[PDB]
Amino acid sequence: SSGLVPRGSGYVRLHTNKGDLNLELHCDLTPKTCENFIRLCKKHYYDGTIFHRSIRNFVIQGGDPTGTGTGGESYWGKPFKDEFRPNLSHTGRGILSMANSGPNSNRSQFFITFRSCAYLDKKHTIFGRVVGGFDVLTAMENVESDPKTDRPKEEIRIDATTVFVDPYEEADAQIAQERKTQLKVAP
C-alpha cells in the first residue's frame, strides 16, 4: 500500500514546564513509529499533556491526552505495529519508546528511560533517544511521585512540541505535488 518513506532522522523538542528536552528519532529504522509521533506533534496532540507515570530509576511516561494512563490514539486512529530492531535496545539513559497493551497495539503514549532495562527489549518499540536537556530529564526524575499511583506529585507537563527536523517532508511533498497535478489536468 501507499506509504511515506522518511529521509533521515527526525528531531523534536518537547517544551516542558521543567525545561526543553530534545529528542532524536530513528526514523529510517522505525518509520511507522516515527511518523505517528511526528504527525501527532505537528497537530498539537501533546500540547498540555502530562507525564502521568514516573518511577525513579526506571521510566517516565506521557502522551495520554486524557491524563488517565489508558487513553490516546495513534495518528491513524487504530493501534499500529511494533517495530523492534536488533540494533536498538534499552541501553543507557534517555531511550525513547512506546507504551502499549500487548503486541502491535501502539497508540500515542510513550516513555523515556532513566537507565538501561534489557527486560523492555522486544516488548516496547524504541524510536529515539534524548540528545539534549539531560539536566531537564534529571529534574523530571527528581519530582516525587505518589507511591500508590506513580503519578508525579507536582505536574510535569508538555506545553508544546516543535518538530525541528521533519524527515517526511520529501514524501509529503511528492504526494501533494502528484495530487495537485492530477486535480489540475486529469480530474
Description:
The PDB classes it as isomerase. Keywords: CIS-trans isomerization, peptidylprolyl isomerase, protein-folding, structural genomics consortium, SGC, isomerase. This protein is an alpha+beta fold and 187 residues long. Helix content is 20%, strand content 26%. The chain contains three helices and eight strands; from the N terminus they run ββαβββββαβα. Strands 1-2-7-5-6-4-3-8 form an eight-stranded antiparallel barrel. The two termini are 22 Å apart.
Cα-atom radius of gyration: 17 Å
Number of strands: 8
| Range of helix content | 10-25%
Q: Write down the CATH class.
A: Mainly Beta
Task: Please give the CATH architecture.
Answer: Beta Barrel
Distance from first to last alpha carbon: 22 Å
Number of helices: 3
Instruction: State the secondary-structure class.
Output: alpha+beta
Name given to the CATH homologous superfamily: Cyclophilin-like
What characterizes the major β-sheet? 8 strands, antiparallel, barrel
Indicate how many domains the architecture comprises: 1
SSE topology string: EEHEEEEEHEH
Write the CATH fold name: Cyclophilin
Subcellular location: Nucleus
Family: Belongs to the cyclophilin-type PPIase family. PPIL2 subfamily.
Organism: Homo sapiens (Human)
Protein name: RING-type E3 ubiquitin-protein ligase PPIL2
